[PDB]
Symmetry: D4
């Protein structure tokens, strides 16, 4: 019932990308919340969100943003919870700015970074699932089924 | 019994991965450290990744440089969360390492950290934050470690 | 009759690119097989395919994939046969991630890499042809004709 | 009383930021120099930026390397103009520093300078040109400094 | 009445981008002029514009150009006023050439650089506003309102 | 009689190409090693490539750095498979070497290897795997070499 | 009557770009020839063209190609005439491969390189014009008029 | 009387530009060598470029690093052909130098050479090939120089 994963994104423009994380979590029946939190436009909203995440029962935070993407890193700065980052594809630099802004965190405050775009959003949800599966047998079995179906469903020849 | 497995493509990667090893030990997290080449010992990798969960491992930290396939292929064979450390390469300064690890397509995640030593240290910290989710004692040690890091930052530079 | 060249690709999405390799081989009447094999979604399928390629009579393997493209490298890890890699153009990084993931193989396990995209797929087939031509006189003559026609057909002035 | 605040992520940034300090002193601009980590001391940053205006600061010069979020997050909490200095990073030579600082989305600006020492010196000069707008005495000193720079350029190289 | 900010751009093609700076200044009721000045096609027009800017009462200059974008730097070469640069997105290199041409100014002549594209144009206007606000109480209050509205208007969840 | 030809643009390339030479000798593959400049001795290159097949060569390994045209132009004049080795360049670290070799348009292939020493060694191994297709004795030596490489990988790092 | 400038391009696909060079030369009434010459598909055509250019009365050669663009460099390898290179925008790497393949010529064989794309094609023609103007008074005057019109025609404000 | 002018942004550029100087002297081409800063001495540059033609100069070779505007701005003020040499920069290895010089929009050309020493030497050679068009004696010396370069290439490396 209560969310165990929090999906936060810099803006509505990131939804086209982060919706893939939302869909995957729902598919695996992982209770979660999906919100918009801007590191630069709503810094206090982020501080409060990240600082209280653990208290509220969250276990993993998936954060996505583009350009000078500080959302994942700053979220990790306030929480002890694992933070996964999704580099959203930017218009000009195609997410290279997003990627470097998120993955290059100095030692001390980590952000598990996924691929640029939709693939990254989907994988952040799967990585969050693999983390929760460590202490949730039922979910672990559903994740096994998901991975097994992925593998079995790959065609043998192109159409 | 090890709960985290640190694997790397070669002895040359140890200079970087030793930082992950030291941090896990610092936080009192039992782990194993091995060399597994995705290219030279593919079957060793398959077996290592396949059996990781049954052997008791909860998280795998994989480091490699250049065309770094170790993290991704490890993740392909295990349902456990896999964290990747891009080892700095001579010519491309780890950019090839970074892209070959972080850009996983949807379906098989690799939580990627920064290029080099910072990434190795952060892979260990991220692994710790994942384990802390179901280990109160470790959660406390991690909280203390994070709090100390924050309290240890100087207020002014030695000008 | 029996295939002497194997064309494998990471997914159906790579077909738009790899079809150019298929077409060229057919044009030169080189018996081949065209399959989908995912390094990360179907790792065991890849291990089995690459390991048994030589036994099955294959002489060259053309592998194409995009993003963190491990298909060519991992295929080369299990076979003694020459492996040619085609970097498929990725959405965000335009195949730069694909290229570095394939070409930057460390010493010991090579992958002859071609250009990003359609040109690369076509050239992988031609390179495979030039390899087979070394011990197939009939094919050698057909390849000579193909190269001669390419050269003679270039217009002298633009339209 | 300080009118410009120079902040940096760590002591390692001082080698670069000292150039901003020296230039402000040269132009007789009162300022403070502090270490504030966006990741290790997020609340220290929030408080510093929030109160800057009321404390009398007119401009903030922030320097950081790698995933450099200090300039952007500082700007998120202050209405004052914030200038960013990308500190050169080991692997990516400051490219990660540059993109993570300059690529701010619309709404929260960071006037970015060049990677390294030149950027730090220019951040100080830019701050000076901003203060000169309402400080006749400083405007005169700056004019003299610029005029001297121009007059000091040699006409031929020492061949 | 008289302009206090000058917006100059390399050509009509830059208008699609620089119009965002114009709109923001008008929104905050900051008197300004918007002109086309080419560093390479109209070098003398630029020299005269930049040299006389201060005399004419201008306080800040916002310059935007793409490709080998010299407009901001050369403008700064002739004026003591703060110059803000907007890298216009170029067709082939997506503004990376524009960005490096503007931000990498050597020590001695600064250019406060903003993000590539529309975001950068908007932020250059906001940065110019934050500079003018230092000595214009009425504007300072309007800027506070603008920043407050930006923060308060961010949705809490995606649509 | 040589069956593989190793050519390079200058003596400076030898530091890198010597690795290809050593490996071929190790596998007992007869070969020749020459310096041929695509830019300084274009006619020497034309003649070398044109006559390679009739001289008994089966594979050509070409190495060059910077604007590396040697591999591509060699391939333009021979029907034989040409392997390219991007030699590391001073400023761009071999990125210019890599792109100028691998990006061949459709019709004239160059199997490209990694930048530097690894690429040179792999060019030799790839050439060996091509020759092994019709040389049982060599095929056996290569199999033994690959098997030894796999068996020689340590299980743990010297911590 | 007889051509004094030769415009050569790798293929019909380059025409969309090189037509801008053709148009400019015609505009300035500079007699020229426009041809398709492929460095890799028609190497002998290139050797003959470049080798005999001077004898035929050509003074400048403008060469354009994309990807691993060797046309300009190899042309310069056979002629003593000034060779100007135009990097054609490639599909995946947007001309970055074209640019590095052309501009990074080692010492001894130069290629005056222009911008990627249409701008580069136009500028190659203008640069060729500025070269011919050194010893053709009539053309020199027409070039002066062209440059004067360019400067005078730049609008003062955007529409 | 000088027919070629070599200009550079600073004494630090001399280490690179001295190669252009030495080559012109080698070919007996009268020239002048000066330091002209586009940013620190903009009016000196305007005057230098404006009067170049009337002073007898036929070609200008300009070198600069980082945000290298010297070549482009020089070309903006002269009708003479301007050749640009990207001087290697500390952090970005001359990539910023290269893009800021070569990417000139249509209308004002700069024939760009390679980053560093090779580019400086080639700028001199390109200038020589331009002057040789109307100087028989020089044309002969250049022909001899090119012929010697070709004849001086070794046939095999010192293994």
């Amino acid at each position: 019932s209560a969310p165990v994963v929090g999906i936060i994104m810099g803006s509505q423009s990131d939804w086209e990308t982060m919706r893939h994380a939302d869909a995957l979590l729902t598919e695996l029946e992982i209770p979660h919340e999906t919100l918009i939190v801007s590191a630069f436009r709503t810094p206090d909203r982020l501080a409060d969100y990240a600082r209280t995440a653990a208290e509220r029962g969250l276990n993993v935070i998936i954060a996505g943003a583009g350009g000078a993407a500080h959302l994942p890193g700053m979220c990790a700065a306030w929480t002890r919870l694992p933070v996964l980052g999704v580099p959203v594809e930017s218009r000009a630099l195609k997410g290279m700015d997003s990627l470097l802004s998120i993955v290059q965190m100095p030692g001390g405050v980590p952000v598990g970074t996924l691929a640029i775009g939709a693939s990254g959003a989907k994988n952040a949800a799967l990585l969050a699932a693999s983390i929760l599966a460590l202490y949730n047998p039922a979910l672990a079995a559903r994740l096994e089924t998901w991975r097994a179906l992925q593998t079995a469903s790959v065609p043998n020849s192109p159409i």
